[PDB]
Each structure stands twice: as C-alpha cells, then as structure tokens.
Amino acid sequence: LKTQQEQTQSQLAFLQRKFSNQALYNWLRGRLAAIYFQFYDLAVARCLM
Amino acid sequence: AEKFWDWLNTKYTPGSSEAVETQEHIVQYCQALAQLEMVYHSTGINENAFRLFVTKPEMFGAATGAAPAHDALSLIMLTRFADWVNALGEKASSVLA
Amino acid sequence: AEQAYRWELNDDSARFIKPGAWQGTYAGLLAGETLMLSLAQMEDAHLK
Amino acid sequence: IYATPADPKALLSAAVATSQGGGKLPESFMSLWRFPHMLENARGMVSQLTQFGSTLQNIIERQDAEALNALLQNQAAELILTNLSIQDKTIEELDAE
Amino acid sequence: IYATPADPKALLSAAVATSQGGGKLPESFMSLWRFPHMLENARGMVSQLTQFGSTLQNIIERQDAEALNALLQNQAAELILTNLSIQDKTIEELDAE
Amino acid sequence: LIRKLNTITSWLHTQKWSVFQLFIMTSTSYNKTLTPEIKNLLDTVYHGL
Hints:
Oligomer: part of a larger assembly
Largest interface: A-D, 32 and 36 residues
Order of helices and strands of chain A: HH
Protein name (chain C): TcdA1
Number of helices of chain A: 2
Radius of gyration of chain A: 20 Å
C-alpha cells in the first residue's frame, strides 16, 4: 500500500507536469474564446455587408 | 485593474527578465487574484451567487458600502451558504433567483 | 499583406499584425488562430 | 437500552444554470461589392467561424476530461491514506493475537 | 508501554510552470502584389499554420496518453512482485498450519 | 475569542483543511516574487488587451 501511495503520487505528478495538462486547456479555451468572440463580430459585419 | 493595465501598457516588456520600478506591486496584485480564485473553488459557491457576493456584500451580511472580506469568518459563511444552496437541490435556482 | 494595406491606403501608423501570436510557453499553439483574426481585421478595415 | 445509529443520509448537490444576455447586431455597412462576391466573402468568414467553434468545442471537452482526471487522482490519493491506517490496525491486531 | 506507529503522512508534489519569452516580429517586406491578392496569399499560409497547430496538438495529447500508458504498466509490473511475495507467505502459513 | 477559535477549528476539521491552507486564502500579505505563473499571466493579458 505504500507503493500504491507512491504510484498514485507518480500519476498525480505526471498529470500536473505533462504538457497537455489542465493548465494548457484553460489557456487554450480562455484565449480561443476571446478570439472566437472577436471573430464573431467581424463575420456578422460581413453578413450584414 | 486600471492601474494594472497602465503598468502593462507602459512599463512591461514581455519576455524580458528585468526589474521594473513598481513590479513588486503588480506581483502582489496577481498573487491576490490567485488567492480569490482559491476562495471560489474551496467554498464551493456557485457562479452566480459569487457575482452577488462580490457586487452586493450587504446581502450576505457585510456592512453597507464595505468591501467584502476573505476573512475566516467570511469564508465560513460562504461555505455555509454553499451548503445551504446544495441542500435545496433542484429548487435551488428558484430560491437564488 | 500589411505593407500592401499600407500602400493601397496612405497610412503607415496603422498596424494589425502585432507580436505575441507565438507563445513559446504553450508551444506556439493557437498562433494561426491569432493571425487569422489579424487578417480579418485588415480586410474589415479595408472594406470600410 | 442499546444505541442504534441512524440511517446514512443521501448527499445532495445543486446544479444551477447560468444565463448570459442576448447581444445586438452591429451597424450595417454598405460595401462596394455586389451580392455574389460579397456573399462568397461572407461565406468564407462564416466557414472560418465554424472552424473556430469546432476547435473551441473540442478544447472545452478536453479541459473537462482533464479536470476530471486530476479530480480522480486527488481522490485516489486521499483514499489510500485510510487504507494505510486500516492496514496498520491489521498489523496491530496480529500483535494482539 | 506499547509502541503506536504514527499516522501515514500525505505525499506532496510540486508542479512549477515554465515561461518562454515573447518573440518579436520580422522586418516587413513590400511585395509586388496588391492587397486582395496578398491577403488571399497570407490567408493560405495562416490556414496551413492552423492545420499544423491542430496536428501538433493531437500529437502532444497522444504522446501524453502513451507516456501515461507506459507508466501504468511499469507500476503494474512493480506491484505484482509484492503480491507474489504475499502469496508465498500464504503458502508458508499453510505449511505452518 | 474562544468561540471564534472554537467555530473555525471545528469547521476546519469538517472541511478537512489545515490552518496553513486556511491562511493562504486569508492572508493579506502577498509575496512579491515574479514567478513563471505570474509571468505567464502578464504575457497573456499584455498580448490579449
């Protein structure tokens, strides 16, 4: 069980240290939702054009 | 936040590791934003009542015109508010509205 | 394309492609989505 | 008289919805182009906007798959501490035996 | 007096972030093409750059899914060695019985 | 003062938190050291706004 505790901690340390972690997708979603809203105003502009 | 953008727009160069004259006050503002992020996740309060606690603190028992507190007596009432909302169940939206 | 925008219209102070589309800390992801927005801001400014 | 503990209650969580206001249209602009060329221009923008929306939808799915994945490992790390204390009482029992 | 072992401590891992510096723009070049033809040329490059970024994002997800998968099998191979030694003590107990 | 300590200490057991975890959410003293996390926040808000 002490091995399984250390093995659980290694998976937890892996999910936090890998590149495609949660902090990547918070960055990707927050940046893209800012782009996608600004791109929305440009495309509705030409739908009105 | 207005002072924060005035610092970025003028005195911050991205990627440069140098000392700006009021850089340490900016860090304390960003350390604060991470603190209040932690307040939201730990108390378990929902998204719309956390608007209401920021904007109308008197509705949660604060004094009139007072800035809200992340005091431990204010963290315990946010948890007891979030436990109160979760006990309402599916009718919790009708009560909070 | 910005130099062509700056030459079809008399303006040199008007810039649309700004630095930081490449974020090296995030492996440069969403660099093309940032530039495609910047190209759509030239074309909207060109049409008007 | 013997003390019988009460039945274990069911936990209950509240899921409220959010609501954002509907926006308004921008002011229309009369461009120089005729309709078949401006429709084809507008269809190129809207096709690009669908590709941002499909990309944004995948990122939302993939941040929730990894917010869950970090949740499941934090729960597994807290649960293994109890089993370590249970196994200590197993060894302490064999010392009493 | 009887020796009681201490409570099992919680393990703790540190996840630091990295930071890469912001680059700068290249020197602009005045090509021969007019703006509608150069915009369409530049939109073809940027569309190809988005397709590299979607491909690169999938490879990053898929190397982390398989770095994890090799981690889970190395952990399963180390854990089965203890259960082999536990089962040896099960057989040795039945020889003592 | 004892009732304030009795209320919060009993509350920290039900939340299963430390005083150290509570003090992070409560402290008004902030560390003035430019971390890579803050530096990523400064680079994103700079290029975004």
